[PDB]
Design a protein around this nucleic acid. Sequence first.
RNA 1: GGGGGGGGCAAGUGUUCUUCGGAAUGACUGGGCGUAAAGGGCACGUAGGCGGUGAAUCGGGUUGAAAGUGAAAGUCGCCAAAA
RNA 2: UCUACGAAGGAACGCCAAAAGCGAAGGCAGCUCUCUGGGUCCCUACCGACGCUGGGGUGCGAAAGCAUGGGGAGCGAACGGGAUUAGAUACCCUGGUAGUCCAUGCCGUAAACGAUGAGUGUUCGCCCUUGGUCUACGCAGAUCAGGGGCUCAGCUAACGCGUGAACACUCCGCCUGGGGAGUACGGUCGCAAGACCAAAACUCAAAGGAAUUGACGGGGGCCUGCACAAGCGGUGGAGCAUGUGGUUUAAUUCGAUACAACGCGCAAAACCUUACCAGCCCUUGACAUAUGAACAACAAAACCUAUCCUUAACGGGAUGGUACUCACUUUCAUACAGGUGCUGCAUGGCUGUCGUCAGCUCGUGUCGUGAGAUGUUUGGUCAAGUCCUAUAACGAGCGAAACCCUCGUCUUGUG
RNA 3: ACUGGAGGAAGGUGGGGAUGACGUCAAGUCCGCAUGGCCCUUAUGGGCUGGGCCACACACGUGCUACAAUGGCAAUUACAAUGGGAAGCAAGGCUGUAAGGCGGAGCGAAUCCGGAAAGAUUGCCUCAGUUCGGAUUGUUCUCUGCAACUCGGGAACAUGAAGUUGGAAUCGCUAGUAAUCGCGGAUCAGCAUGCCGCGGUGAAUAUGUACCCGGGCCCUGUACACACCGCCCGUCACACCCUGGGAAU
Length: 281
Amino acid sequence: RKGNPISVRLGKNRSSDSSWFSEYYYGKFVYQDVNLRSYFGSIRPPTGFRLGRCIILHFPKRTFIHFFLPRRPSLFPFFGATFFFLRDGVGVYNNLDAREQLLNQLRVKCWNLVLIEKLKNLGGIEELIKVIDMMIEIILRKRGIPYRYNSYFYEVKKMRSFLSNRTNTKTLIESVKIKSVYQSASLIAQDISFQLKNKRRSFHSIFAKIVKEIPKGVEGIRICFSGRLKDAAEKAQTKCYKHRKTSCNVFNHKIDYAPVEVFTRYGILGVKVWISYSQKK
RNA sequence: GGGGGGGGCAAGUGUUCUUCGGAAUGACUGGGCGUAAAGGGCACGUAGGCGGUGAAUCGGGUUGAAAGUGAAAGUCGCCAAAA
RNA sequence: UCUACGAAGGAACGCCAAAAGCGAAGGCAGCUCUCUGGGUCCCUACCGACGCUGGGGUGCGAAAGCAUGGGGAGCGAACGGGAUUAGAUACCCUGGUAGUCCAUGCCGUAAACGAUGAGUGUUCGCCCUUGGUCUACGCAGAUCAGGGGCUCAGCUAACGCGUGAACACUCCGCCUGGGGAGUACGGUCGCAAGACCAAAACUCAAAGGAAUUGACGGGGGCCUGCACAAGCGGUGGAGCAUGUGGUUUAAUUCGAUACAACGCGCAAAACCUUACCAGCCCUUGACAUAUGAACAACAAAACCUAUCCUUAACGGGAUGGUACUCACUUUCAUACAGGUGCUGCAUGGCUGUCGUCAGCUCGUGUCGUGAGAUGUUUGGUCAAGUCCUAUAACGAGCGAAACCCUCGUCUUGUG
RNA sequence: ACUGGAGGAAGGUGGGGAUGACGUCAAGUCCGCAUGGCCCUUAUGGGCUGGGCCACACACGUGCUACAAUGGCAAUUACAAUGGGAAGCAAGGCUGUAAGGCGGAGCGAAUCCGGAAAGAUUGCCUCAGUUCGGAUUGUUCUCUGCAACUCGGGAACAUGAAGUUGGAAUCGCUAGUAAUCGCGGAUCAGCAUGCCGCGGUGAAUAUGUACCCGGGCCCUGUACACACCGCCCGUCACACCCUGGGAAU
């Protein structure tokens, strides 16, 4: 009785997130999918600050990953000619330019050290060049302590290290700014599960913010709560709000649903969100 | 119930007793009695209450005026001293 | 029994007939006659304000009851049996006296109920209708007394009345929470039964009226489901397998409990699974962070591929070898880790459930002082609040349908 | 809208699934997971073996087997579908009465693997407690595992409980369904009378709302609102309290 809207719509509406196939490894691909969905959540979400849908793809030694982030509040066996053709186009910290600036002012910021140990050393050195390039390169790798490079989030490099090391495959991680924030359902759930965490907030104010900002062509929003409500602390009960088009017995209706559970030390409260998308726009 | 904190009053506070008000909750001012408590089983009739007109008279009630009295203290208005 | 005629009696009065009529009220009817109360109509004559109500008082006052004397058909308390039931003083049957009836007396009470004191004046109408009166010219129009509906307004907490429960009036009786209680005491009246005046102690925060929703009903009023009906086969009897109810120790682990638990978690108990029971031990623990007193290694130690030995097993004891980290997991010590420990009457999630039932509702509008009513209350259709029709609602959401897949027929395309 | 009729392979939701409102029942489970609160912190914690979860005077539930001759058995022959297979499915040959054993063509699987059972042909039976019926019930054995006395299947052969349609009741079903026929997975070394799926064969009956039953409507009545398994009256037994009559005073 009363299924959710996932198990019906995979036939027509939705494409399941991943896309691949195995015969012997399926048993170790369903897990490399589920645990990684567990990951991408609980990654500096304090507040919201960070969310996601994370459509993934697996190829034979290639793995595509595409997050979805809202706004912050010759010889042919040179196959490099088609690999970096596609594993490059980010622009996330195209360190070419800031590295260029560091290259420019590097001469000064090092040559001014290299004259109590500059001229004396030049005397002893041009008396006694590659081995001098050794007492030269000692200071290039001194700047582990002071360092002025940057990145919006090179955490992409960070994870393309972690997982490619522990899985042994060529990987690609991108993030795309989902502009119209939380038109999805997992996003809305992740959101209101933050305001319900400290400090406390109003249900009616949450729904007022919702009807304030979100109704931009979304067909309807049906939202339920549950838990030890405010505030008799006994007899946990339910309440739910509705809107124009709130249907699930009708097919061909992308209506995404993902509950969540956050607490108040008085037991736990849990919300559910059943949005409905205007189809055929 | 205990710790802390705060409100109300203040050389006074709180409980009980005591009487009025709220209490139109005995209703003259200020009610009800069909279904809510309350119209008698019904009438008769005694006092008793109350109850047509116009004309006349009297002046008991009625009413207008004066004095006596309605102790002083009290209530109250003012005034002044008193703190 | 019946069937025709008779006789005896008693008792009530069929139809008319009547929300009709008469009475002050209780009441009153087969008929005829004597006597007799009150009434209304009527030119109107007189008469003259003599009226209205009415404390204590006075009569009347159904039924049952009492007294004395009649009568006793039928009915029928009490009682008898047939019954009926777990039981039956009952309801059901058959008997059946007192009683019903008449004569006179006694009580003096009834839901004596329009549950509405009595009287006077003023009030929009319509419909009637009992009996009077005036006027009649196709026929009624008018006017009085009443009896009965329906209404304008007015009032009412609500229903409702409107011959008032309206607008006002005078008089009478009474009420002041429920219970205790119309009880005790007491005074009168009665042959008795009893009647009439009639409290309080004590006790509670309620007792209650009308109306709304909802449920309910061995009540109507439809309509429907292997529910029943037409069926066909099964558990219940025997033997086994499984599960639970039980009782048995050391355990017979635990949760499930009408449809909606019990071949259920279980999609799989040798040990393991396993919480349960005994031995066997461990306790910063198998596991996690920080924790530095530590120990020192710039490679020790540990630690681990393999050999040996003991432990019912865990281990453990070696014993090589491999193997290294300036971090040692390596050490004890800590803060702790942990608990299939308790709690679903704290919860989330999940599920069963009514039920694939067709019913749930919302927004404005109205109506209701209000709770709430309307939309979904009409005639039909549907498997459906599916639909049309009607409509003070107009609409929307949820639900249903169709969307989905599948099979079935066929079309094409890769083969 | 209904009734037919047409075509059509399908006629009026063609059949099946899927999909399951408000909400109700403090329904279920803190023993899956998560979680509040409360307790133990050499213990209710961790691990090891043993032993227990499998018993039994006992009732109840679900499933299986049949009492037969529409049949039990032996030899002949006919027809599936799903599916499953690398801790794997394994043809053939050889070996064992057989269960088992030796080894292996192919197959990670439209290609390799898999005697369908009913049914049908003949014969035996000839109506028995039986050649129907098989629990209990002996010896040999064997599969796994390190390990089969309490505590997994499997084969040989002998024994052969009750059972002759099973009370009252009560349950399941309206056409590929009932009933039976097997076949195939599932968890898993060892395993199904259980569960999930697949196909063989295959009807009874449609009187329809009279009835009991169940549900809805709406129309009435209610003292019910924990909503009839509701409220609720009265005697008696019980405690405390108050009060009346009452001889005599």
